[PDB]
Design a protein around this ligand. Structure first.
Ligand SMILES: [Mg+2]
Ligand SMILES: [Mg+2]
Ligand SMILES: [Mg+2]
Ligand SMILES: [Mg+2]
Ligand SMILES: [Mg+2]
Ligand SMILES: [Mg+2]
Ligand SMILES: [Mg+2]
Ligand SMILES: [Mg+2]
Ligand SMILES: [Mg+2]
Lengths: 174, 43, 144, 124
RNA sequence: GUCUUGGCCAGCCAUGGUGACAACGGGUAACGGAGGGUUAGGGCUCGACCCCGGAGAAGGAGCCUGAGAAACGGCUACUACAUCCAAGGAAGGCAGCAGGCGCGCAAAUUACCCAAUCCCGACACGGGGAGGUAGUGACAAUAAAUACUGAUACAGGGCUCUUUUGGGUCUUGUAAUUGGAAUGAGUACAAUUUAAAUCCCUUAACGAGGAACAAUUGGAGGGCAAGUCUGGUGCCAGCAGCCGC
């Protein structure tokens, strides 16, 4: 069977716009990202919700299609944490910005919760198996943490921090 | 007046200068860190 | 504007008129007639291989004074003879008589690009080795 | 390891059609790599008051980060039911049945094709 | 005649049937479609190819068995190609799976197994290059390493004062000045996976200080982000999608 697969980013329409290049570099440095692709990734996803939210606003308020689809969109937004309970219904979705979707990343939250003291150290720890969510170890910095899950981040029980067992370097100096 | 016998003229006449060895630049996430530092921080 | 028909039952005239007038479009006419399969030196392919027959020099068009280095290549697939430009400084030495080279398009859609008159193809690989690889210090020409 | 191995059972169902009990087993084994198929079997047997030959497990995939494995466990009512029902590949790996030794697939096919040129008792 | 209707065919009779609303003929580098790409709307283009229908098994024709075939891993004949030979004869159809030649710009192992999906048989039991597994594999797609950090010294932006004793220690950089912890790429007891193996996953004892475990591909006049640097050549060599050097 032909297995479905898709793309998570788009190359910008104009390759060498000075304003666009500078704005992207603001997000890369602030959040300690890797390249421009995962910046384009978040913008593509953010466009998807914004495109979907706008197309429903064109319908009728009483129209059942808008009611079901609109509430479905908000539930993911509220659950993820980019949106609050007081943001009804969809006019506040259009105010979402690329920055807002970026704090919900595990790289940012591990830093905003004081686990790491620099955003570059924060990403390194996650990818290096030193951060777990609940009972689950997560090593993907793009892991989007929900508000419910935001209260269950701590170091891994196998890591020298939290677990206590010395690592390879500390054992070597013995 | 050019000719087929002049091929590779300047290429053969250019002296060979070896590249100066330098400390390696960081790659990936780190490479973006100094670029962001030099552009919007060290101002 | 034009005096196009505006009846409700004039779809036949509108389609027929569009079909006639679409032939004047250069790009549709090229595709519809299938001229790439008929008259192009390639069989509509992106690349083609051939045997180098000789090395020729082409004088650059005004205002430009230089001898562009080229080779006469006879395509293997159909036997047609074309002239291929040899790019980069001193790459004509790598090409020799009776070599097997791969040619590609030279610019945009079979039109000669730059100050090289009448040359519409370029040499990509010689003896199975990339010309850039030979031109740099990356690969070695086959011993043969 | 010093820490105990915790046994769990979900999706338990009694299946007299094959004379067995089907369930999914969960293991909590922190600070140790994993548990072998063998030592897994006695623990199930001692939990269900059965024998080692009463119990068979299919496949243990350890969960990412360690400390947990999941798999499909099969325990039988009678040892005869296991022998009659459990597939031969499962029997050979657990050890109470002999492997059916045979030639290579291509050689058996080549062996068969030569037979087609022979007729009667001359084949054997 | 056919399973049956039918100019399907045989006899007799009549002169009709199609066409400018494109018949007939020709081309297709045309299998049809569900659909792929790209689009505000209207569209353009592709569709050999994981699914449904059709046709074919070197090119035509004919036929037996059989419910079902004009079957080709069935037969018969002709054409082309081709194998063995004692020269009298015999035997053939990879657009099935591997593999080879040729062709080309252009596309993988003469591997393992029916364990999984199903099919077939007298059939719980046997068979299945259907099919699955593994190997080659930068077609395309997802996630994501190549580094983290404390202090010291210096500089900048602040803060009370400008007696300019200014670092005094809020922050950010430079630290060519040092101390640290951590890990996977790799490797391997063991366990796990599997029909049996491999890999992932899990994990003992190993595995990092730049010389290492060292990221490349294009470009720096404009379109279009980036040099008023230095050396060489001197309308030569060469660059340049276009304007141009
Ligand atoms: Mg009308
Ligand atoms: Mg065709
Ligand atoms: Mg074809
Ligand atoms: Mg026949
Ligand atoms: Mg084949
Ligand atoms: Mg440059
Ligand atoms: Mg430019
Ligand atoms: Mg500009
Ligand atoms: Mg000009």
């Amino acid at each position: 069977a032909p297995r479905s697969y898709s793309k998570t980013a788009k190359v910008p329409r104009r390759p060498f716009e000075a304003a666009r290049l500078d704005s992207e570099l603001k997000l890369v440095g602030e959040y300690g990202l890797r390249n421009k692709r995962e910046v384009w990734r978040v913008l593509l996803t953010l466009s998807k919700i914004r495109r979907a939210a706008r197309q429903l606003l064109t319908l009728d308020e009483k129209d059942p299609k808008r009611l079901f689809e609109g509430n479905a969109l908000i539930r993911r937004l509220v659950r993820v944490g980019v949106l609050d309970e007081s943001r009804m219904k969809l006019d506040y979705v259009l105010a979402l910005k690329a920055e807002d979707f970026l704090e919900r990343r595990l790289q940012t939250c591990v830093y905003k919760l004081g686990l790491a003291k620099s955003i570059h150290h924060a990403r390194v720890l996650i990818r290096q198996r030193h951060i777990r969510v609940g009972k689950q170890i997560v090593n993907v910095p793009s892991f989007v943490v929900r508000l419910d899950s935001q209260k269950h981040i701590d170091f891994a029980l196998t890591s020298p921090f939290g677990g206590g067992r010395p690592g390879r370097v500390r054992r070597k100096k013995a | 007046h050019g000719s087929l016998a002049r091929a590779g003229k300047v290429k053969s006449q250019t002296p060979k200068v070896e590249p100066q060895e330098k400390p390696k630049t960081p790659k990936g996430r780190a490479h973006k860190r100094e670029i962001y530092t030099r552009r919007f921080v060290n101002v | 504007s034009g005096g196009k028909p505006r009846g409700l039952n004039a779809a036949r005239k509108l389609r027929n008129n569009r079909r006639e007038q679409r032939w004047s479009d250069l790009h549709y006419k090229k595709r519809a007639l299938g001229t790439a399969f008929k008259s192009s030196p390639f069989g509509g392919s992106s690349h083609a291989k051939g045997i180098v027959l000789e090395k020729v020099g082409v004088e650059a068009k005004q205002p430009n004074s230089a001898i562009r280095k080229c080779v006469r290549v006879q395509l293997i697939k159909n036997g047609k003879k074309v002239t291929a430009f040899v790019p980069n400084d001193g790459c004509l030495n790598f090409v020799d008589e009776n070599d097997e080279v791969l040619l590609a398009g030279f610019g945009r859609k079979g039109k000669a690009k730059g100050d090289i008159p009448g040359v519409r193809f370029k040499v990509v690989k010689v003896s199975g080795v990339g010309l850039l690889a030979l031109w740099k210090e990356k690969k070695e020409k086959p011993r043969s | 390891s010093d820490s105990p191995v915790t046994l769990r059972t979900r999706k338990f169902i009694r299946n007299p059609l094959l004379g067995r009990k089907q369930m999914v087993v969960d293991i909590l084994h922190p600070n140790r790599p994993n548990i072998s198929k063998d030592e897994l079997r006695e623990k199930l047997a001692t939990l269900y008051k059965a024998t080692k030959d009463q119990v068979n497990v299919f496949g243990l995939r350890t969960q990412f980060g360690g400390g947990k494995t999941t798999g499909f466990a099969l325990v039988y009512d009678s040892p005869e039911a296991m022998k009659k029902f459990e597939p031969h590949y499962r029997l050979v790996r657990v050890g109470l049945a002999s492997k059916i030794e045979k030639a290579s697939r291509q050689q058996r096919k080549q062996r068969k094709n030569r037979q087609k040129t022979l007729r009667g008792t001359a084949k054997v």
